[PDB]
Design a protein around this ligand. Structure first.
Ligand SMILES: Nc1ncnc2c1ncn2[C@@H]1O[C@H](COP(=O)(O)OP(=O)(O)OP(=O)(O)O)[C@@H](O)[C@H]1O
Ligand SMILES: [Mg+2]
Ligand SMILES: [Zn+2]
Ligand SMILES: [Zn+2]
Lengths: 343, 256, 51
DNA sequence: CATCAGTTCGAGTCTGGTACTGCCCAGTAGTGATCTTATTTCATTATGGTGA
């Protein structure tokens, strides 16, 4: 039996939930995006910025979590002789339930999330406000000006030299209030990456494509990855999607495997290739069914918690706009050669 | 969220009817701080402190907090430390486990030297600042210095024993014996209905002298090294032997 | 207390505002004001001359 | 008999229980000065279709 063991049936529904919610799946798209992301992380080659575009609710965070855990369990053997080197840093850091993104808040959050992993007592930040305490935590004030916080964060990032600086939901970096330009914000972040030498992998949804290429310096230093969705036009991609559905069915914590394969195309209208969204929808449906103690999932349950068509078409339009902005074709290549002058 | 000196000055001292309590509650109550040892003693000031804390807090077992239960079996002659005694290892263990840091009664005994739980002699001076602190200062705090105000605990402390296999092991065994004896004494405090009296020491001495000393004191005095005058004082009058002397006699009998 | 009184008197005679710090700065042991009467005497002198 | 054990007297030493002294620092709330910033106006600037 390649599926879930038959001993998870006698356990209450809470144990089934606690087994399923931390259970992840390996679709080929995830494997390929993880491989390419791990490769570009391991050799950055003077790339200050990595941009990771992708749809919402596809697994772009399941991917980041796997990256962090792998980078940790790689650097842990190296932590027996190398001191003050965090294997991975992954945060959101952009307007946490805030009206406008603040640079001071971003700097202080980066500092506190960069130091809290390790209980270090010998670090002397180049500042008079931020310091450590006997308990080993990081003590910050509300008085230090933003340049001082920038100095402290730069010194910390230089001394610690983390592999990555994973930031999530970065599309809200554009919340610049009024009177500011986006190129200034990228210049500041790329500068931080320059004097520090760290790799900033900005992930998130398609809004990110707002920054794709602003300046030539930004253009040459940026490494772009597109975590593309599942598109029904490709036949092998449809095969992979239905196979993912089977894999869900085989590991679905139920007495018997319910019949949801036949509704594959219907699932598409509720999924649009967003594997994350499908996972949340299935988890909510199974939780609701198991609250009523139902051993099988039917089409009625799928129609009870199904997504709304208006929301689906809205995200479809957003995804189409993003893909047509990202789209690359032979015409672009030929235009590049024509501009260059290579006959 | 107030300093212990402030709590003593503004909440305890006015509630105490003694003249010096009220007077020193307005010019610095240094009398109660320079003699914080006696707050844990057998005497009237310790009992008054327990009574006032009971009035302030309305508890029912604050008498077990001190060894006032044994006001008839001990003696404050060279018994209490003038300076603080703490185990840093216990401080971190309790802090890291999430429990509260609590100063132990056993540490206040001059006879106790090491921590039975973490096998290390207690510290009697602040490692960061070479200054002494009494058992209760104006800014005392669990786990902090009374003058520097920094954490005194450590996973590994800065004090270690000397290198020697001649008498260091015997001294360590004696310290373990004394610490275990006092710990069992404190533990049996709660189970015991009432404290043994001085007459209990009288009959115990009558038994031991008549057991192996065939009713003589010179042999016993030479065996324990104490002058015979003190032996007569212990065995005839209402004089309580010192705790060190008491458990040295016990060790000579090899009985707790 | 007397010495404080002549100090505040002379300081006002010259023209400066006689405050606690200024009076302390020209008196050899500027810590006696912790006594509950010296400060009272200084305040009484200030009120007598109108502060 | 003279040695050693059981008794006394008074001094040595600690310590609790009780009161008291000589001294300046630290925190907070006024003003006046000088920047500093999320946010509100004063012009040009491009887009628009039709009757003389
Ligand atoms: N491959 C997967 N296996 C299991 N669960 C998954 C998978 N991909 C996504 N999820 C689920 O998706 C939820 C989180 O949303 P998801 O990571 O898919 O969104 P996202 O598109 O990365 O988010 P955002 O747009 O905010 O960057 C979690 O409940 C997680 O279990
Ligand atoms: Mg995400
Ligand atoms: Zn301990
Ligand atoms: Zn200290």
């Amino acid at each position: 039996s390649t599926g879930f063991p038959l001993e998870l049936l006698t356990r209450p529904a809470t144990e089934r939930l606690a087994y399923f919610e931390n259970y992840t799946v390996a679709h080929p798209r995830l494997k390929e995006v993880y491989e390419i992301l791990m490769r570009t992380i391991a050799e950055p080659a003077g790339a200050s910025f990595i941009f990771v575009y992708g749809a919402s609710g596809v697994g772009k965070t399941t991917l980041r979590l796997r990256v962090e855990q792998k980078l940790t369990e790689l650097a842990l053997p190296k932590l027996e002789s190398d001191r003050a080197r965090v294997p991975v840093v992954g945060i959101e850091a952009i307007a946490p339930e805030s009206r406008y993104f603040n640079w001071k808040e971003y700097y202080t959050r980066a500092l506190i999330t960069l130091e809290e992993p390790l209980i270090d007592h010998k670090f002397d930040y180049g500042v008079r406000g931020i310091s450590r305490d006997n308990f080993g935590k990081i003590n910050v004030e509300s008085k230090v000006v933003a340049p001082a916080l920038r100095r402290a964060l730069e010194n910390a990032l230089i001394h610690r030299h983390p592999d990555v600086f994973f930031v999530d939901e970065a599309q809200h970096f554009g919340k610049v209030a009024s009177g500011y330009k986006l190129q200034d914000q990228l210049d500041c972040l790329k500068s931080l990456a320059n004097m520090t030498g760290i790799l900033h992998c900005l992930l998130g949804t398609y809004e990110l494509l707002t920054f794709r290429n602003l300046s030539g310096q930004l253009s040459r230093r940026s490494v772009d990855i597109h975590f593309r969705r599942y598109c029904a036009d490709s036949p092998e991609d449809v095969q992979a999607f239905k196979s993912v559905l089977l894999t869900f069915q085989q590991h679905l914590p139920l007495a018997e495997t319910p019949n949801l394969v036949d509704h594959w195309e219907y699932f598409y209208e509720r999924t649009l290739g967003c594997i994350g969204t499908l996972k949340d929808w299935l988890k909510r449906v199974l939780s609701d069914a198991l609250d009523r103690e139902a051993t099988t999932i039917t089409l009625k349950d799928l129609q009870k918690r199904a997504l709304s068509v208006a929301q689906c078409q809205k995200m479809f339009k957003e995804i189409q706009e993003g893909e047509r902005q990202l789209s690359e074709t032979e015409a672009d290549v030929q235009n590049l050669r024509s501009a260059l002058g290579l006959g | 969220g107030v300093l212990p000196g402030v709590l003593m000055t503004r909440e305890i001292a006015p509630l105490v009817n003694k003249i010096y309590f009220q007077n020193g509650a307005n010019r610095g109550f240094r009398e109660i701080f320079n003699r914080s040892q006696a707050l844990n003693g057998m005497g009237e000031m310790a009992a008054d402190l327990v009574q006032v804390l009971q009035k302030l807090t309305l508890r029912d077992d604050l008498r077990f907090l001190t060894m006032l239960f044994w006001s008839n079996i001990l003696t404050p002659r060279n018994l209490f430390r003038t300076r603080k005694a703490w185990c840093p290892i216990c401080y971190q263990e309790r802090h890291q486990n999430g429990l509260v840091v609590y100063e132990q009664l056993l540490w206040t005994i001059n006879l106790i030297t090491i921590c039975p739980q973490h096998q290390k002699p207690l510290v009697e001076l602040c490692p960061h600042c070479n200054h002494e602190s009494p058992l209760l200062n104006w800014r005392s705090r669990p786990g902090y210095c009374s003058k520097c105000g920094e954490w005194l605990g450590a996973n590994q402390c800065l004090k270690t024993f000397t290198d020697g296999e001649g008498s260091i092991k015997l001294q360590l065994e004696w310290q373990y014996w004394t610490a275990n004896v006092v710990g069992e004494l404190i533990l049996a405090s709660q189970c015991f209905e009432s404290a043994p009296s001085k007459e209990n020491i009288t009959k115990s001495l009558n038994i031991v002298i008549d057991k192996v000393a065939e009713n003589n004191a010179a042999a016993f005095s030479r065996l324990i090294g104490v002058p015979k005058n003190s032996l007569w004082m212990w065995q005839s009058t209402k004089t309580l032997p010192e705790l060190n002397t008491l458990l040295k006699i016990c060790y000579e009998l090899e009985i707790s | 207390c007397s010495e404080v009184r002549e100090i505040v008197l002379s300081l006002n005679a010259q023209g400066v505002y006689p405050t606690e710090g200024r009076v302390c700065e020209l008196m050899p042991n500027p810590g006696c004001f912790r006594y509950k009467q010296v400060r009272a005497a200084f305040n009484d002198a200030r009120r007598e001359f109108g502060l």
